Structures are given as C-alpha cells and as structure tokens.
C-alpha cells in the first residue's frame, strides 16, 4: 500500500550543462577504425539538462522531502544519476499513470530486476522503504509502496540488477537512455566511477544497449522511484535521511540529430561530432573527418474577379415548379458555380451526392450541369436515388444505375399547399412499360387496363394517366409537398464551362512568398515594375524561360518576380 507524503511545493527548475554525454550504439554491427554518420535520436552536445536532488533541504525549519516530479518523455530520455548509496531504485512510465492506461515499472532491488507492464494504481509519491537488518546490514530489505493495485499484467522480466550495490566520496555515475520506438522500449546503460565532480563530468563514454523489450504502450510521461531510509511517521530533525541529498539525477531529452561516430580499432565509440552544434562541426561532418535558401513566409493565391454566377436562384428560389411529367430540365454552362451556398445554407432536407463527394464540388470543373426542378410528396423524395424502384423510380423519373450528381430536396408546405388543396401537380400510376434513360413522357393517352381498347375514352378498365395530389397545409409529413432539384454533372473529355469559385487572397509585395497567379505557381519576391505589357500577355518571360514578371489578375499592375535570395 502507498503512503502519502507532503506537497512538492513546485521547486523552481535548475539546469546544468551536458558535456558530450549520452552517445550510444545506434546499430548492432561491429565497426572498427571507421567514421560512421548516423541520424538518430541523440542528446545534443552541450545541452541544458535539468538536475534534481534526491533529497532537498529547502525549508527554514529543515524539512527533508523528495524531489520526484512527473517529467515528460519527449522522444527519449537521457537519465544520468550520480550517487553513492542506492537511493534511486527504478522508474515508472505511462501516459496517465493510473488504471485507465497501461504502465511500465522497472525496479532494482538487492537481488534482481523487476520489469512489469500493468495498469498500476500509482500513488502521488511512489517509493521504496529501505531498511537494514538488525545483525547483517550487508543487504537492504525493501518495502514497495509505489502502486495500490496490480492487474491485467502483459509482461514480466527478471535479470541481473541494473544498478549495482553501492554500499565515502566514491560517487558513481550511471547513465541510461530510454527510447520508445516501434513498440520497442530500448534501454541503454553505462556505469562509470566518478571522482570529485559535482556535475556531469567532462569526457566521453558510450552507452551499450541493455534491453529491447517489445511493448506497445505509449509513454510521454515518467517518474523516478526513490528509497526512504528515514521514517515517514517520525521525520528526524537531521541526518535521519542520507546527508541531505548530495546525490542527484539529471534528465535531458533526445532530439533527432546527425552524429559522426569514431569507432576505434577495438570497436568502441571513442569520439563523436554533433553536426548541428557549431560551424566547424558542420565542416567536420561534411568532410566525414575529425580533422542556404531563404524560406517563404506564407502562400499567396490570386485569381481574377468572380463575375458570372449560376442561375441557381432561378432554379431553387423559383416561384413555381412544374409537374412530375414535364421536368424543368435546365442547362447550366459558361458560368461559375458556388455550391457552398446550397450546402452551408442547409435549408434542404435531402442532399445526396453520387459519384462525387459533396465537399469537393467547389474544386471540380464540369462541362455541363443539368437541373431538374419539380414537386413531390415526402416518401417519394426519399425514393429518388440510383438503383431503386417504385412508382416514381419506374414511371416518371428514370435514374441510371451509375449517376454522377446530387439530389436535393426541401419541404414546401408554406409554398405549394393551399387550404382547398393544390391539384396542379399530377402523378401517374399506370403505364404500359417502365422508362428508359431520361424520358420525359407527357402523353395523355388513356391506358387500357382490360382487354378492350379505350380509343381515348374512359370507361370500364379505362383510366386517365394523371391523378391529382391533395397538397394541404394540414397534411402529414409523408403527404406534405417537397420541392426537389436534381443536379446532374457532366465530366467528359471536353473543356469545362461550369467551374467552382476560385478563392484569391491578399497581395504581399517586397516579401519572399509562395505565389499562384492564375495557375502559375512559384516562390519568390514581388516588386512593382515599369514594364509595358500589352492588353494580353498575362505573364512575361526572360531570355531563357523562367518567367521574370507576371500580371496580377485582379489588378492589371505588372509585378516583376525576383528569385528568393539564396
């Protein structure tokens, strides 16, 4: 079970410098007396790593409280520890560090390691209570108080202790690198004896890989596990803990860097060069031996003034829609279509597009658009879609199996219904045969239901083709009128006459920008020019292609283009 400790009080951060530490072996091959360039997650040279005391005495009274913040895990962690008496015991990794997410626990007791991957209920202050025996004192018994419950474990690992026994100024430096790549938790480690150096020593030591555990959990957060020698029930005035935390641990974060590593004759990494540190390091990496374009700020798009618009208002906002035999097939061409109007307006109950997604209508350009506008009862507006049947799908409107276009319907109670009933919309129930593609049959011949001919006169088994619809404002939703328009789009190998609206932006002069002038794309700086273009000649050209000047589509001013300085 866990034990509650005091508030961490958010101690201000303190930094230190990492003199070329944290270099490990990137690949598992033997290399001898060779200089190899590797791009990987390395700790940058001479970086600022944050250092925490295991025990910090900061209160005026002399309070001894651990400094174990929950630190980020950004693309790997270089964890160094300089200590003398094994106060650091392990780590916990996880996203929420609770039962909602899986968590990784590594602990080094006096005998072995414990690596577990379970959804532990980690408390606010996980730690190991370490006590010596009354007679031997050679080893230390540890009481785990780091999680409340362990369940649903998916991993278990035991091996030789990561941290050796440290049982008086012979401080030791233990360096670890933690990476979480491709479901693999990789740990690199190295142990060195350090003498009379408070911070990370100056020198080079390469980290040999330790374990490559296959683990799917994401981490992005971690904490260090420490051991209490003192008692939480009774905190002593002083010296109950271990000499007020002279030992400490440093944390740095790996970054994607290119290193030049020098494998000596025995195969150990003796030296490394960080290519992004200083210009001379850049030269060393370029020569593979130990002995520039201005970016564009933003993008600019300019298209000419939008002038021609579709007569969608004459279709959708029309006063009267025709019957269900004579569809108002209207041709639409040679003008710009803004379908964001009918889409974002969302006044239409049904809006179904087949063969085209409804959000990319503004981007596609079509040869022709055909609009059919009419009025139909509720259920039947649901019926209009390809491959279906029914009285309307088989007797009035013929709709192909493959149909590129959009059916659009809205309710029309307040427009098409009258108190006495609008019988001006007529519907058929009888025909000799089903329709063929886009046949607008308006024939009024009397159908012969029986075996005798009708000769254009009703009677027994003779009926007029056209019945009336009782559109009334009190009708139920299924029987209510709906104004519907089907827009069929033609995409064939011909020039487009119906095009979406092109969205131009503002003009930025005298600045390195990405530009798009009427389809001409490029990067460069634009300046006012005194050139003399003709009424035509939208974009000028130099001696060898490479357009020097362009004409702004909206404003006829000629802007000359200079390549962005490099």
């Amino acid at each position: 079970q866990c034990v509650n400790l005091t508030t961490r009080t958010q101690l201000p951060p303190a930094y230190t410098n990492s003199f070329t530490r944290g270099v490990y072996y990137p690949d598992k091959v033997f290399r001898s007396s060779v200089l190899h360039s590797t791009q990987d997650l390395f700790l940058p040279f001479f970086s600022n790593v944050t250092w925490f005391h295991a025990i910090h005495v900061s209160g005026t009274n002399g309070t001894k409280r651990f400094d174990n913040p929950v630190l980020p895990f950004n693309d790997g962690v270089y964890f160094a520890s300089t200590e003398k008496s094994n106060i650091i015991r392990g780590w916990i990794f996880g996203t929420t560090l609770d039962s909602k997410t899986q968590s990784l626990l590594i602990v080094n007791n006096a005998t072995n390691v414990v690596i577990k991957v379970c959804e532990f209920q980690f408390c606010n202050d996980p730690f190991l209570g370490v006590y010596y025996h009354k007679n031997n004192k050679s080893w230390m018994e540890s009481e785990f108080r780091v999680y409340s419950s362990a369940n649903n474990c998916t991993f278990e690992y035991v091996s030789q202790p990561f941290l050796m026994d440290l049982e008086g100024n012979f401080k030791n430096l233990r360096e670890f690198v933690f990476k979480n790549i491709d479901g693999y938790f990789k740990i690199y480690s190295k142990h060195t004896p350090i003498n009379l150096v408070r911070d990370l020593p100056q020198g080079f030591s390469a980290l040999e890989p330790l374990v490559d555990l296959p683990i799917g959990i994401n981490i992005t957060r971690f904490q260090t596990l420490l051991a209490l020698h003192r008692s939480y029930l009774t905190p002593g005035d002083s010296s109950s803990g271990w000499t007020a935390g002279a030992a400490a641990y440093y944390v740095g974060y790996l970054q994607p860097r290119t290193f030049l590593l020098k494998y000596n004759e025995n195969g150990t990494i003796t030296d490394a060069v960080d290519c992004a540190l200083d210009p001379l390091s850049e030269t060393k990496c370029t020569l593979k031996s130990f002995t520039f374009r201005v970016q564009p700020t933003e993008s600019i798009v300019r298209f000419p003034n939008i002038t021609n618009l579709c007569p969608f208002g004459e279709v959708f906002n029309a006063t009267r829609f025709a019957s269900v035999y004579a569809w108002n097939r209207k041709r639409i061409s040679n003008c710009v279509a803004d379908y964001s109007v009918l889409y974002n307006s969302a006044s239409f109950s049904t809006f179904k597009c087949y063969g085209v997604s409804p959000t990319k209508l503004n981007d596609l350009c079509f040869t022709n658009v055909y609009a059919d506008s009419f009025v139909i009862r509720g259920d039947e507006v649901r019926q209009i879609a390809p491959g279906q049947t029914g009285k309307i799908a088989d007797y009035n409107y013929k709709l192909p199996d493959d149909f590129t276009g959009c059916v659009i319907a809205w309710n029309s109670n307040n427009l098409d219904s009258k108190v006495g009933g609008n019988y001006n919309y007529l519907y058929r129930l009888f025909r000799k045969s089903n329709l063929k593609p886009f046949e607008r049959d308006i024939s009024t011949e009397i159908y012969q239901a029986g075996s005798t001919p009708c000769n254009g006169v009703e009677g027994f088994n003779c009926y007029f083709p056209l019945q009336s619809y009782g559109f009334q404002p009190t009708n139920g939703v299924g029987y209510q009128p709906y104004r519907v328009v089907v827009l069929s789009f033609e995409l064939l190998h011909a020039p487009a006459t119906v095009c979406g609206p092109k969205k131009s932006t503002n003009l930025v002069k005298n600045k390195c920008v990405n530009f798009n002038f009427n389809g001409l794309t490029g990067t460069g700086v634009l300046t006012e020019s005194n050139k003399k273009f003709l009424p035509f000649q939208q974009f000028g050209r130099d001696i060898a292609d490479t357009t020097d000047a362009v004409r702004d589509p909206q404003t006829l001013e000629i802007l000359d283009i200079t390549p962005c300085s490099f």
């Epitope: 025709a322 019957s323 004579a326 308006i442 009024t444």
Partner: nanobody, 115 residues
Framework: QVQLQESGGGLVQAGGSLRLSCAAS????????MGWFRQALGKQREMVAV???????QYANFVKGRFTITRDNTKNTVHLQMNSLIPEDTAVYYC?????????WGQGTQVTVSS
C-alpha cells in the same frame, strides 16, 4: 410569361349554349396540346377534353356528344362550343397547356345551368 385568356361563360338556362375561348400567349412552342378541365365545388379536377397539335379530339365519357373543341392555327387559340346543357355541367373550367415543360393554367370561366 405564358398567359391563358379565359372567356365565354356565365348563366344559361337548361338546354342553352355558349362558346368558351382559350387564348394562348407567351413562349408556346410549336408542339402544344390544349385541354379543358372541370371543377365543381367539392370535387377535384376532372378532364373535360384535350386536342394536341395533331388536331385529334379526346373527349371524356361524361359529356359524350355535347362539348366540342375547334382550333385556330392562325392565332393558335381554342374554342369550346358548349351545347345541350344539363345542370350536372355546373362547374368552373380551366385550360391546360401541355407544351413541353412548366404547364400553365388560366384564371377560369364560371358555368351555371339551372332552372
């Protein structure tokens, strides 16, 4: 704006006669089909008769041998000769221009026959 002018109705005693007129203006392309429809208060739209551009006559069984339609090609107008009147014919009538799309109606002619 296609307009259908209505004329020729009114009050007539049983057995009388009238001559209604359907006048078409506007686009009215060459293939038209003009008809007359009946509506009495409390009933729906009843097809009285139709003539297409072929000049064929299609009449309903309600009025066998009583109504007649004549065409005028010069003005493309229509006339109902309305004879042998009975009090079951008391209903307002309307033209119907089939044309090709957006069928247009007229404003109506009241027909009353009673004694």
């Amino acid at each position: 704006q296609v307009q259908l002018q209505e004329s020729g109705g009114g009050l007539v005693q049983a057995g009388g006669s009238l001559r209604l007129s359907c006048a078409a203006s506007g686009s009215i392309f060459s293939p038209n089909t003009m008809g007359w429809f009946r509506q009495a208060l409390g009933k729906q739209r009843e097809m009285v008769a139709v003539i297409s551009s072929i000049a064929s006559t299609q009449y309903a069984n309600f009025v066998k041998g009583r109504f007649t339609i004549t065409r005028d090609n010069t003005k493309n107008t229509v006339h109902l000769q309305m004879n042998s009147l009975i009090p079951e014919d008391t209903a307002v009538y309307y033209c119907y221009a089939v044309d090709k799309s957006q069928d247009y109606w007229g404003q109506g002619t009241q027909v009353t026959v009673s004694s």
